[PDB]
TrEMBL record, chain B:
GO terms for molecular function: ribosome binding; structural constituent of ribosome. This is Large ribosomal subunit protein bL27. NCBIfam families: L27 (TIGR00062). The keyword Repeat does not apply. Signal peptide: none annotated. SUPFAM superfamilies: Ribosomal L27 protein-like. GO terms for cellular component: cytosolic large ribosomal subunit. Keywords: Ribonucleoprotein, Ribosomal protein. The keyword Ribosomal protein applies.
Length: 58, 79, 136, 94, 116
RNA sequence: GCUCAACGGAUAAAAGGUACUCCGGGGAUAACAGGCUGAUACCGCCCAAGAGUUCAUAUCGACGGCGGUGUUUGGCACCU
RNA sequence: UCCUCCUAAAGAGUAACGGAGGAGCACGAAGGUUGGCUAAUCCUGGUCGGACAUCAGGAGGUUAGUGCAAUGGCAUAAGCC
RNA sequence: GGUUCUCCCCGAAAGCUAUUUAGGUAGCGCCUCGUGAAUUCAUCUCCGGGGGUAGAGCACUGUUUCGGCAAGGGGGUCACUUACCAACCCGAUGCAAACUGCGAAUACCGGAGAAUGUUAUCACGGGAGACACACGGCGGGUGCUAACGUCCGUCGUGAAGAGGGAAACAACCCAGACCGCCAGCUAAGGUCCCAAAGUCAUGGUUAAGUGGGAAACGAUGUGGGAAGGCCCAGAC
RNA sequence: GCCUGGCGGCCGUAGCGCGGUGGUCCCACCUGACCCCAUGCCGAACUCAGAAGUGAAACGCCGUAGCGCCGAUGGUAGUGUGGGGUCUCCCCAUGCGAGAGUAGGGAACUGCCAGGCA
């Protein structure tokens, strides 16, 4: 499709287990990971869930 | 005077919808002690002596509201 | 002092006091006194405030009471350990939200109702303001 | 009579209304008649003084907008609980 | 009044039959006529019917509204149901006592061959 | 066939004193003192019916309300 | 020890020497089935009879009833013969 | 109370139930090792589902104020009167953990789909430890919406996590330490000196060392905005 | 095409109230009841044998907005996630978004079988 870049930016220590599971599903491991994921509504929902800490490039 | 002395083990309220147990007659799909708002829809076998609903053989569990007084029934789609 | 004639239950949970008041309009009288903050309001306070304005106007006009002490407040004795059941009711209170109208008056001039409500506010613990009947 | 200048809103909801009220304005709705209802915004400072007069709810207002001249009548008002402010106004076409 | 009481009487069986899911022979009795019809398990479509308001049956009796006419109508229903092939119907009294004219019709059908 | 009701039921079968006391432990738990709190107590202030012949505030001040201290009676059991 | 409600945060579960009440039974019919029936309360009229007994009619439509505390149910009646 | 050499990997709990039990012990919940197994398990999108909490409301159960009509009761004669009170009903106005003719957001159960995750899921077997928790946020009971009080639900941290900030300061904010570098970029927080980095730029406000503790209430402190009475034919 | 009866779908926009209207057929009243059957007494109900008479009651249909009922748009309350403040309570970004009330709607719709009337 078009794909998009997702960077973790902030840390996940005092975050909720659901948010940590969202990060795991997105595949982000540390700060500044900059992973690439296909742009689909499910990925958009995952991004929106933790938008307060992730940064999107497109 | 006097406190504590509260009953224990209020059992259960809701045990599933759709093909959650499915197989055989099951023993859920009912709020025990309820009767009202949970009636047998014919598709599932009637209540037990303690007002417990259960299935016939198989199928999905569905809830509907129909008939006078707008009472809610539980039916099962045979498959 | 005002309190219910009979009580379905003699003790009640503490509960919280959140949100805005429901009755915020001058309905019965022509002038009203309405709260701006939140807090408790005891029967003794209501009674003293009532006397304030009632004697301020002596014999003139009519006065309404919008609030009413509904929930009881308990308190255990002085030298008593914690626990051993809940305390005993000591007085009745009314929970009031900001914007709640407390008292109203009809048959008095504005220039006198203002002073009567000033005197009543002096007694009341929560801060209040003067409002007019106006229209819808 | 009374003439009130209004602008058509472009974003509706709790946050938008709160921002409008922070900007010394307030939303209102014009409905009734046969046309579809439309939401507008008015200025609090000018509308409050005009509403203070008891004729505002008596005679027919004139909601002047970009060339429509709807001349509606005031139907309902929602005010702030504990201060002299206006939260919302419902107008019915007449 | 009387009709409402009859419906109240008949409701329980009326819907117990649908819970069991079976074709039901429903009979409606009036002082002047009598009707019977076979209702499908879903309760929406009629498979067979017969009464004393038609030219046939009613033109070959003394007076519609007696046990003889009830027996004639029962014979008609039984024969037509057999023609259609439907069998194993559940008779319902529809709030009437089973001993009166409704005793006939039912007796006539079961002797005709309908599996009461 | 058990009010084994201390109701998962130490025996079929069972009460007290120790200031003459003793052992193993505990600040996991009280008494003295410290700590937190400030209901109560002490001090201050707000309104002002009234007393003061007249006159609210020279001096007091009802019905009510808001604070300060850590200072009595209390609460907690954080240290020993 | 057991049962009902709230606390209990709209699945279940959830503590305090928290807030309120009950149980340690009863029935050989108060069980089964068939047939049938529908309440409280008020108003009008009528000997004893009246605020209230019984009778007739009309309002009302479950505010009645359930072997027993509370909750949830029950007109199809789980209520009455 | 004490329990003696080294390194590597993983890594808890202070809960439920029972207990002549409460600082003990047992089963389960949680940890580790081994074997086996299905697309199992987690996040997101869509679809189906029950609810009665927040909120709201007053038809019901209770309570509450005003107004109207008006049974009934009562003072004052022997059959009238009423400066008396008041049921039901109607209109308006509030309140409820043990009220509901309404009703979310979340959470939970089930189904389908993509991606991602060292199977993260389940079953069996060997070994355990643990059942004194603490504080902070949110929802509550109790207490005085007092306590570094106490008792629950859920999340985070400490316990068992070093480092940077809050002065000092387990439990607060940022952030998870394999080892070395006299290397670069950042987070919270900061840039006059102590002490690393703006005596940076533009537009305002404060005169109080306010900043750098504390309320009801009081006041021609001072900045800003929208209106009113009065008016140079003479205003204060 | 209508009108009527029976069995259903749906479960108040489907109800109630007020006015009008219907008898060829159907329906209900309606006559008698030594019998089948029955009344805690009563052909009131149930039941049987009929068709002299009437649409009065009941029932069906039509009109009517008095009540019941349904009900937007907008605003408000609440709330998940993230952040903040004088923090017993609130605010900001974002997502969800009531209840009540207002305008308004509203005198149901529909399937099968049978009969009267073309
Ligand atoms: Mg025990
Ligand atoms: Mg001695
Ligand atoms: Mg010793
Ligand atoms: Mg200690
Ligand atoms: Mg001490
Ligand atoms: Mg002390
Ligand atoms: Mg402790
Ligand atoms: Mg010490
Ligand atoms: Mg629950
Ligand atoms: Mg929950
Ligand atoms: Mg637990
Ligand atoms: Mg029984
Ligand atoms: Mg029966
Ligand atoms: Mg029975
Ligand atoms: Mg590790
Ligand atoms: Mg233990
Ligand atoms: Mg509430
Ligand atoms: Mg413990
Ligand atoms: Mg704990
Ligand atoms: Mg603690
Ligand atoms: Mg330890
Ligand atoms: Mg640390
Ligand atoms: Mg330091
Ligand atoms: Mg200072």
């Amino acid at each position: 499709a078009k794909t998009i870049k997702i960077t973790q930016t902030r840390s996940a220590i005092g975050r909720l287990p659901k948010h940590k599971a969202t990060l795991l599903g997105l595949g982000l491991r540390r700060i500044g990971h900059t992973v690439e994921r296909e742009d689909t509504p499910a990925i958009r929902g995952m991004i929106n869930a933790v938008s307060f800490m992730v940064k999107v490039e497109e | 005077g006097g406190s504590t002395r509260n009953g224990r083990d209020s059992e259960a309220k809701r045990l599933g919808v759709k093909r959650f147990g499915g197989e055989s007659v099951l023993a859920g799909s009912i709020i025990v002690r309820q009767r009202g708002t949970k009636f047998h829809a014919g598709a599932n076998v009637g209540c037990g002596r303690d007002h417990t609903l259960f299935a016939k053989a198989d199928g999905k569990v569905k809830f509907e509201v129909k008939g006078p007084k707008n009472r809610k029934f539980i039916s099962i789609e045979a498959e | 002092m005002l309190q219910p004639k009979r009580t379905k239950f003699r003790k009640m949970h503490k509960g919280r006091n959140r949100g805005l008041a429901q009755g915020t309009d001058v309905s019965f009288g022509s002038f009203g006194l309405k709260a701006v903050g939140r807090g408790r309001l005891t029967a003794r306070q209501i009674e003293a405030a009532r006397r304030a304005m009632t004697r301020a106007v002596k014999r003139q006009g009519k006065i309404w009471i919008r609030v009413f002490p509904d929930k009881p407040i308990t308190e255990k004795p002085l030298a008593v350990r914690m626990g051993k059941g809940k305390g005993n009711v000591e007085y009745w209170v009314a929970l009031i939200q900001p914007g709640k109208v407390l008292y109203e008056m009809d048959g008095v001039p504005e220039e006198l109702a203002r002073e009567a409500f000033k005197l009543a506010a002096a007694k009341l613990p929560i801060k209040t303001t003067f409002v007019t009947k106006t229209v819808m | 009579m009374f003439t009130i200048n209004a602008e058509v809103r472009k974003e509706q909801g709790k946050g938008a209304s709160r921002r409008l009220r922070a900007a010394n304005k307030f939303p209102a709705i014009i409905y009734g008649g046969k046309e579809a209802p439309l939401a507008i915004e008015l200025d609090h400072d000018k509308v409050m003084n005009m509403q203070a007069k008891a004729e505002f709810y008596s005679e027919v207002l004139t909601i002047v907008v970009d060339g429509k001249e709807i001349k509606v009548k005031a139907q309902d008002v929602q005010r702030h609980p504990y201060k002299p402010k206006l939260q919302h106004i419902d107008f019915v076409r007449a | 009044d009387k009709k409402s009481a009859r419906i109240r009487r008949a409701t329980r069986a009326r819907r117990k039959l649908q819970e069991l899911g079976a074709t039901r022979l429903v009979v409606h009795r009036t002082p002047r006529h009598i009707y019977a019809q076979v209702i499908a398990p879903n309760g929406s479509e009629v498979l067979v019917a017969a009464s004393t308001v038609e030219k046939a049956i009613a033109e070959q009796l003394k007076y519609t509204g007696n046990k003889d006419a009830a027996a004639a109508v029962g014979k008609a229903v039984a024969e037509r149901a057999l023609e259609k092939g439907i069998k194993d119907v559940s008779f319902d009294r529809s709030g009437f006592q089973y001993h009166g004219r409704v005793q006939a019709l039912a007796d006539a059908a079961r002797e005709a061959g309908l599996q009461f």
